[PDB]
Amino acid sequence: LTCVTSKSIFGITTENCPDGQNLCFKKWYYIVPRYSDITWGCAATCPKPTNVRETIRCCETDKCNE
């Protein structure tokens, strides 16, 4: 399984995930109305928002987390 792990206006980077990590994630962390930090990666289980600023989505196919 191949996930996005970083993105810019110039393109994406991807990784082929560790064995046993069969989900891709995208995670938004809200900082101010105009701006949110966003991270992307492989995961074993769908990360749980531990903060109210956090929004996560997960999926199971190649590069699905863009």
Author numbering: 1 to 66
Pull text from the paper.
Despite high primary structure identity, often greater than 55%, muscarinic and adrenergic toxins exhibit distinct pharmacological profiles and clear functional differences. “Loop grafting” has been used to construct seven chimeric toxins to dissect how the affinity, selectivity and functionality for the muscarinic and adrenergic receptors depend on shuffling loops between various toxins.
On the other hand, the mode of interaction of MT1 with muscarinic receptors is less precisely defined, but its selectivity profile for M1 and M4 receptors has been clearly established (review in,). Based on previous data reporting adrenergic effects of MT1 in tissue preparations, the ability of various MTs to interact with adrenoceptors was investigated, showing that MT1 interacts efficiently with mAChRs and also with α1A- and α2B-adrenoceptors. MT1 superimposition onto MT7 by least-squares fit shows large deviations in both the loops and in the sequence-conserved disulphide-bridged scaffold leading to important differences when the main chain atoms are compared (rmsd MT1 vs MT7 = 3.22±0.01 Å, depending on the molecule in the asymmetric unit that are compared). A better match can be obtained by not matching consecutive residues but only the secondary-structure elements. Secondary-structure matching (SSM) for the MT1/MT7 comparison leads to a value of around 1.34 Å where the matched residues have a reduced sequence identity of only 66%. The affinity of MT7 for hM4 is very low (pKi: 4.87±0.06), approximately 40-fold less than that of MT1 (pKi: 6.50±0.04). Equilibrium binding experiments with [3H]-Prazosin show that MT1 and MT7 toxins interact with α1A-adrenoceptor with relatively high (pKi: 7.21±0.16) and very low affinity (pKi >4.7), respectively. The tip of this loop is relatively independent of the rest of the toxin in MT7 but in MT1 with the longer loop 3 this is no longer the case.
